[PDB]
C-alpha cells in the first residue's frame, strides 16, 4: 500500500473509518480516531504491541488522549510526532521523516481568497470566549472562563495538547503554600516577588510580578482542587527557598498539570479543537474583538464569533530564525521546545494591534542533554546535582539563574558541561529516572570510572566531588557560593549527564496589564483581547526564574479566563 487508507481499503469499506456522509467529523478527527480505537484498541492497548525496553511510540509522557491521527494520517504518509525531539528506532507504517513546515501568519496572506470567503460566511460558531492554545495558560483560561459561566472554544494548532507546558519538569513556583508549610518551608509572596524581580534584572513589570507572586498560592490551590498533586516542593535557581511545586517524589510538574487541566476540561465538556490554528483576531468597526478566524487542518478556514479571544499561544523559542534576529548569539542552538512554538500567536496578537515587549530577552536553558537533545530539568541541580567541566571541575553556582548558568557552561571546554549526581539525588527526584530511561545518564560505581566513560578526568572529578561534599558538610560553598547545598553526592552510583544550553523560553511577547488585557503601543486596552502565558511579555523581565512560567500560565490563564468571562 502507498498509504494507510489504501492498506485498510484492501479489506474494509470507507465507512469503517468514516461517518456515513463521509465528511470529516471535525478538525480533531474525533469520529475517525474513535474508529481507529474501535479496532486497534486504545493507545494503551496499542502500546502493548509496540513496547521497546526504553521507549514506546504509543505510551509516551504526552498527557491527554493523544489521537492516532496525531501520527498516522490515512491518505498520505505522515510523520511521527516524537521525531520532533527524539530519534527513536521507529518503523511506523507509511512514515515520512519529521519535517515541520508550517506557513507563518504572514505567509497565510497567500490565502486571502479563501480567508475573505470564510470571513464573509456565517461564523461556524458563536460563543463568549475563544481560547487559543492548549498549553497551561489556555487550558486554565478555558476552564476559568467556563467556570465563570462563559461558553468557550479552546483551539490548539498541533495534533496534541499541552504545548511546551506538558514538557515542564521542575515545578510551579508559589509562596506561602500549605504544600510548603507541610514541608516545613517558610516563604512569602513578597519573597517570591523579590526573587523574581532580581532574577529578571528588575526589567520585569512590577505589577505583573505582583499578580504572579500574590496569586501563586491561589493558583496552586486551584490546581490542587482540580486534582493536581503539587506537594513536592523543590529548589530552582535564583530562589531564596524551595518553592517549585510538583507531584510527589519530584515527577514532572508539566505533563501532570496539563493532564489535570485536560481532565478538568473534558469533565466540563469544554469544546477543544485540535489541528485548529488561530490566524487572525477579528475586530468589529469599534475595534473590539468580534471573533477569530481559524484554519482547521481538515475543515479549512472558518471563524468563530466571540466577545473575547484569549491568546495563550506560548513562546517562539523553537523559531531559531526569529530568536537569531533578536539574539544573534542563540543562532543555531537546539531548542527544548515543542515543534509549533514558533511565535505565530505573537503575530496574531500583533496583527490585532497588541504591542510587544521585551522581545530581545530570550532564555537559553543551560542544561539541554547533549546526547538526548532535550531539556534536563534544573530541578536536577536544585535537588543537589553539581555541574562539572571536561576538566572534572565545578565552575558555576549550579543554582544560579539560567542566563549565568548558560554563559558559564558555554565558557567550558567543548561548550558543554556534565551534571554530576548520585543515587541520593536520583532518588529525591523521580524525573531523573526519566533521563536514565532516555539513555542520557551514564553511570558507574566510581567517579574515576564515570569520568573515563565520559571523557572527564576521573581523578579531578573524584576530588571535585569530595571537595563539593565537604562544602555540603561545612554548609557553605566558598568555591561558587551555591546558596543551597541539599545533599552530599555519596550514595550509591554516580551519574553524569552531558549538558549544553538550548533555546527555551521567550520572556518577551504581547503587552498585557494585570487583568491580562492586551495593550497596543499607545498603551490602550484592546477590548476583548487577552493574553496569558509565555505569549505575554513583562512578567519575567530579562531572565525568567525556573518555576515561574508554570506559576505564570496558571495564574494568568485563570485570570484571563475570568476577566474574559466577565467582559463577557
Ligand atoms: C522542555 C520544557 C520544560 C519546561 N519546564 C518547566 C518547569 O518545570 N517549570 C516552569 O516554570 N517552566 C518550565 N518550562 C516553561 C514552561 O513550560 C512554558 O513556558 C510553557 O508552559 C508556556 O505555557 P503556555 O501555556 O504559555 O504555552 P504552551 O504550553 O507552549 O502552549 C501553547 C499552545 O498554543 C498552540 N498555538 C500556538 N500558536 C497557535 C495558534 N496560532 N493557533 C492555535 N494554537 C496555537 C501551541 O501549539 C501550544 O500548544 C519548560 C518548557 C520546556 C520547553
Ligand atoms: C485512521 C484510523 C486507523 C489507524 C491509524 C490504524 C492503524 C493501523 C496501522 C498503522 C496498521 C498497520 C498497516 C501496515 O502494517 O501496513 C493497521 C492495520 C490494520 N488495521 Fe488499522 N487503523 C485504523 C483504522 C482501522 C479500522 C477502522 C479497522 C477495522 C475496521 C482497522 C483494522 C486493522 C487491521 C485488521 C489491520 C491489519 C492487522 C491487524 O490489526 O490484525 N484499522 N492499522
Ligand atoms: C476509499 C475509501 C475512502 C475514501 C473515499 C475516503 C475519503 C476521504 C476524503 C475525501 C478525505 C478528506 C476529507 C476532507 O479533506 O474534508 C478523507 C480523509 C481522511 N480519511 Fe478517508 N476515505 C476512505 C477510507 C478511509 C480509511 C480506510 C481510513 C482509515 C483507515 C480513513 C480515514 C481518514 C482520515 C483519518 C482522514 C483525515 C486525513 C488523513 O489522515 O488522510 N479513510 N477520506
Ligand atoms: C490508538 C491510537 C493509535 C493506533 C490505533 C495506532 C496504530 C498502530 C499500529 C496498528 C501500529 C503497528 C504496530 C504493530 O502492531 O506492529 C502502530 C505503529 C506505530 N505507531 Fe501508532 N497508533 C496510534 C497512535 C500513535 C501515535 C499517537 C503515534 C506517535 C506518537 C504513533 C506512532 C507509531 C509508530 C512510531 C509506530 C511504529 C512502532 C515502532 O516502530 O515501535 N501511533 N500504530
Ligand atoms: C509521543 C511522543 C514521544 C514519545 C513516545 C517520547 C518518548 C520519550 C521517552 C521514552 C523518554 C525517556 C523518559 C520516559 O520514558 O518518558 C522521553 C523523555 C523526554 N522527552 Fe519525549 N517522547 C515523545 C515526544 C517528545 C517531544 C515532541 C518532546 C519535546 C517537545 C519530548 C521531550 C522530552 C523530554 C524533555 C524528555 C526528558 C524527560 C522528561 O522531561 O520527562 N518528547 N520521551
Ligand atoms: O525544569 C526546568 O529545568 C525548567 C524550568 C523552567 O523553564 O521554568
Ligand atoms: Na513571553
From Swiss-Prot:
Which residues of the sequence carry a binding annotation for heme c 2?
8, 36, 39-40, 94
Q: Any idea of its EC number?
A: 1.3.2.4
Quick one: which residues bind heme c 4? 61, 82, 85-86, 431
Predominant cellular place of this UniProt entry's protein: periplasm
Which residues does the record give as heme c 3 binding sites? Answer: 52, 58, 68, 71-72, 91
Active-site residues from the entry: 402
Q: Which reaction does it catalyse?
A: 2 Fe(III)-[cytochrome c] + succinate = fumarate + 2 Fe(II)-[cytochrome c] + 2 H(+)
Alphabetical GO CC annotations of the entry are: outer membrane-bounded periplasmic space
Question: Binding positions for FAD?
Answer: 137, 156, 164-165, 169-171, 278, 338, 505, 534, 549-550
- What upregulates this protein? By anaerobiosis and fumarate.
Q: Disulphide bridges in this chain?
A: none
Q: Where is this region: Flavoprotein-like?
A: 118-568
Q: Which sites bind fumarate? A: 377-378, 402, 504, 544, 547
Record carries keyword Electron transport: yes
Q: Which family does it belong to?
A: In the C-terminal section; belongs to the FAD-dependent oxidoreductase 2 family. FRD/SDH subfamily.
Q: What is this protein called?
A: Fumarate reductase (cytochrome)
The primary gene name is fccA
